[PDB]
Amino acid sequence: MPSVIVVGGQWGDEGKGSIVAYLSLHDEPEIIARGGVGTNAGHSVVINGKKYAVRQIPTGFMQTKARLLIGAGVLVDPEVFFHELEQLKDFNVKDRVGIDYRCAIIEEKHKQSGCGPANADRVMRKAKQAKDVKELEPYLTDVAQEINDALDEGSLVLVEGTQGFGLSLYYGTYPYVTSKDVTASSVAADVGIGPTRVDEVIVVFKSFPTRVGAGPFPTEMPMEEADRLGLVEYGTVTGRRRRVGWFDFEMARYSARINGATMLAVTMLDKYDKEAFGVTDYDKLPRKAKEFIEEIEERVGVPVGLIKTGPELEHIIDRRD
Template identity: 65%
Template sequence: MVCSIIVGGQWGDEGKGKIISYLCSEDKPNIIARGGVGPNAGHTVTIGDKKFGIRMVPTGFPYREAKLCIGAGVLVDPDVLLKEIEMLKEFNVKERLTVDYRCGIIEERHKIEDREDKHLSEEIGTTGTGCGPANRDRVLRILKQAKDIDELKDYLGDVSEIVNDALDEGKDVLIEGTQGTFLSLYYGTYPYVTSKDTTASSFAADIGIGPTKVDEVIVVFKSFPTRVGAGPFPTEMSLEEAEKLGIVEYGTVTGRRRRVGYFDFDLARKACRLNGATQIALTGLDKYDKSCYGVREFEKLSDKAKEFIEKIEDITKVPVTLISTGPEMKQIIDLRKEKL
């Protein structure tokens, strides 16, 4: 039995979807459960020549043998969720998905308020998906729950019971966290943060498992971190500099261009401590050093790339076990057997 949590170590957009897809194909978990805030986090899943922009369904959906769960701590926008279920019908998501009956519900009024609030929309740079106002109503104990929505009745269940039963039976569980550590309401660059905590501890609570049930916490870092919206970014480079490096990216949910920066080693160390990281997954190494594109053996990496990885390990005291060297799922170096 292994229970693993995947966490973004920066400001989101670290490439968690690629890492999750790889882990699903290799480790074949019995359950893939989504924690996090809600539909304000977007992930792009590429399958062959098709791209799927996902905001609610767990991004491990292409692995058809796993049950899919959305934990009680996640906010659900029924319109977004039902559209995704329909979009992903070829993957039998409808038959595999359980939504915890205690999930909070985002209503249209929450989205309107999110977009029209000048502080949230203009100063903070909110995604406008209604998550902040909905979480406020949750704290006030006036928010509707999934059990109150007729359209969701076919998907309702107790995710905490499902996941804990699976772990008791010796099954494998993969928990997907969303956003990134420094968008945490508690530990991020407040007030330029999301509306709840986004570290591993909260993702476990979102699903309904205790900390002693967690075996691995994999923190994902991007070689050149990015950020969407306002807020501090100590190592940010100019857009012109990013273009010279060939790094031009846009947010999945908002379509806004992502700000780009250099790797921040001190921030990486902090992220590992906040999450209790046991492993690091490093993405975009091919952008750090183009000679590493598609490399699948550590020994074949350039000296520049090896020194970069060794410095990350030296400063964070956490092993880099997964190294992405390109966009395709097979373009990855897996060092877990050697380092764990």
């Protein structure tokens, strides 16, 4: 059934984790594969007051009745993998987690995240694979296999990528980008699925774009201003203070076009307008809020099917009728 690919249209941290979590529970997909680079991104989600952060395992772990797979095109770090298996032991992920036996491994000599150096040898065919380490075996499998199997069985499959279009290796702010393409097409290749097998493509966006480290930020705002509006965010893995800037409709439109976005997702709308916090019904949104949304759909050319009005799961407006 309608396979959904979730990717970011900015510079990562758009809240891809929250969206995947919502869909995992509301839609109840049978498979939740993870794509992208590796563990250099910690997708977070707030489950009833408790904040979570995963870098290896998909952000759909809350859905016990579903397998969590990791695409072959994704780098795996044994240290973080097992760490999260313990952190999520309450969800019994260790029983439904599968790592493609063709995934590249991130060794300490790479970490010297290590995703960059890892891919360096990856394309140089010098790094080992998942089936080369003993610790990783009871989880090995063929993600491309299971995904296609369920896909033919009309089963729902949800895949999530990492980073954002802005960090794309091809269409990103080179050289200030990741070590690979993060478009919906790439994510599909990471899990082993044909482009014609993809039904829906959701490009996530957040009221205020953010950056991590050097890089061109046209809509960037003085951090002094980011403090007044209260948009100060810290990396879930580095604790680094991300740079903030106002929405970039131009980029949003472009990033949504190349990704062939069939749906748009907006998050942290409450940060743009306090009067929108908790809203579940679009019609119950304040003028200012509706203005922003409508403006996005007209500037991007794609309708927003999901709107996050808070960090909690219930804080979201689902209009995918």
